[PDB]
Design a protein around this ligand. Sequence first.
Ligand SMILES: CC(=O)C[C@H](c1ccccc1)c1c(O)c2ccccc2oc1=O
Ligand SMILES: CCCCCCCCCCCCCC(=O)O
Ligand SMILES: CCCCCCCCCCCCCC(=O)O
Ligand SMILES: CCCCCCCCCCCCCC(=O)O
Ligand SMILES: CCCCCCCCCCCCCC(=O)O
Length: 582
Amino acid sequence: HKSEVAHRFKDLGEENFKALVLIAFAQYLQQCPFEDLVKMVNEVTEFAKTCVADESAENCDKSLHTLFGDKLCTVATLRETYGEMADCCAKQEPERNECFLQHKDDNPNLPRLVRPEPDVMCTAFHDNEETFLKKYLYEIARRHPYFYAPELLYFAKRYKAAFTECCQAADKAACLLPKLDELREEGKASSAKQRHKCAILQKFGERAFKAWAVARLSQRFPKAEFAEVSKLVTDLTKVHTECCHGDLLECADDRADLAKYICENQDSISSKLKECCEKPLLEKSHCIAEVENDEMPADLPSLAADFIESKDVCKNYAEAKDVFLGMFLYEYARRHPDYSVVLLLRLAKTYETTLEKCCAAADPHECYSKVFDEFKPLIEEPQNLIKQNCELFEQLGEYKFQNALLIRYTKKVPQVSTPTLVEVARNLGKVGSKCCKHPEAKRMPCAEDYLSIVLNQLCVLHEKTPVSDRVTKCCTESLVNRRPCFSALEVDETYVPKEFNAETFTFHADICTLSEEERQIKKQTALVELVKHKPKATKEQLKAVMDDFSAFVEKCCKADDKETCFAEEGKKLIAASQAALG
Ligand SMILES: CC(=O)C[C@H](c1ccccc1)c1c(O)c2ccccc2oc1=O
Ligand SMILES: CCCCCCCCCCCCCC(=O)O
Ligand SMILES: CCCCCCCCCCCCCC(=O)O
Ligand SMILES: CCCCCCCCCCCCCC(=O)O
Ligand SMILES: CCCCCCCCCCCCCC(=O)O
């Protein structure tokens, strides 16, 4: 208890310490140059080593909050660069750290991070490994100031491994670009999934978040007793509140406490944690969050005894409605690791609605008896959408699946900008690639994890620049209704076709040389524009026009005179297409 900074140095070790301190300063000091933060991290590291040698030395006795805040207040250009943030230095703890948190900028004005050429990256990696890796760690942390530093650190070690492996290969590019791409997607998805959990907490409140956490922990930890899940759900909520406010030291400490609690009580929680509970303090929390679902106990009774068929259902409910509803959710969820969390919550809200209505009626048991009937169609709707979409994904490419989604979603919401329709259809295509490789036992949770992210992204974007009442309705819907609401969108009956623009459907020989990704984006853009222009086109008409386009590109990219034929065969393509459509 003597030196917080000594204790975290000894626990983390110097290399992790230095990294996290760099991430933390970069999350706060987003416009400070790399060399200035490196010098702060080395001074903080020197000071922490005085506390490691003497837990009683000067200032070693201070809160990490206090030490962190004082270091920020030694920044010479604090007022010049960050303006009103420098006024936090005029306060004392805990007001100062509160004031610093109040001034973390969610979207700094920083240019997109452009990935250098593989050979350039590998020369840089070989020439100064430490500086190469620390600099991009800085670039990411300063652009992602709420991304949990220990997890940003876990990604950085995977990036290091990819460089170490691939800067061996003869084709550096063919090894490295696929590992970097997958790491980036997992990075972005991890950050999204955190933002989703903060939106549940922040937009729907503590009850909705705790319902969400009971279901998810009950699927993960099915041998856990309900009181043990209730306890974990309380602690989860404080971790997420702090993490959501973006207070790294408070969040880190609530996580370490919960990760120590879980590891002291494995036999009450899960047989899947032995691995995770061997790992250092730094990762242990993170390993737990990733653990595989435990096998559920054999010989579980059906839910009907307690929830459905018992005398005492209305009595037990009315005593403590949230506690009984929480029990139902735990019993349902621990039996159905194959259900989405949201599906389980839709069932618990149906059960709740039933008991509200049935417990007031003449024959309560007559009324609440039939409830499992209303559950079947709730379960079947997401299972059938997944079946139908994965069948379509299997029939078509990943790429032609995307094109099918672009036609579908453009006809439903043609007021959405082209670039966004292309990025939503392309991301949805990627959810089909990822989750259709699961067996149906694991599809619904996969689809939930990745669709909720796409839908949060879409709703954030739409809140900033709204274009459709129907999307506002779906985005402001209840947590359980959002995805069904988007699923219920029909073809827009009222949309005014977009006016013909020859420029939009004119191609050049440039298309032949473009990268695959970029060629696919140029064609998917034109397909959206075709649909905004001919929204009544049938799947036969659009398919006819797209195959003529495809024959036209295959003809014109192999022609003696590329440009002439792109121009002349282009005018014919446009004319035939207009006549055939609308
Ligand atoms: C996506 C996973 O469900 C993460 C999980 C969780 C579950 C429900 C709501 C929030 C988060 C999760 C944690 O984030 C966690 C963090 C620290 C310590 C233990 C944890 O256990 C966990 O299951
Ligand atoms: C201690 C945990 C008690 C949890 C309360 C369970 C209530 C489940 C009812 C369904 C409400 C789901 C929340 C939502 O509307 O998003
Ligand atoms: C399989 C990905 C292709 C994209 C669109 C298909 C969406 C299927 C909806 C699945 C819903 C699961 C979560 C829920 O219970 O609402
Ligand atoms: C402006 C975005 C396009 C509108 C569609 C939003 C994305 C679809 C999300 C729901 C998809 C679930 C599968 C479905 O039922 O189509
Ligand atoms: C009315 C103007 C008509 C012009 C042609 C429209 C072009 C849209 C084509 C997109 C089809 C891509 C399929 C493929 O990959 O080959």
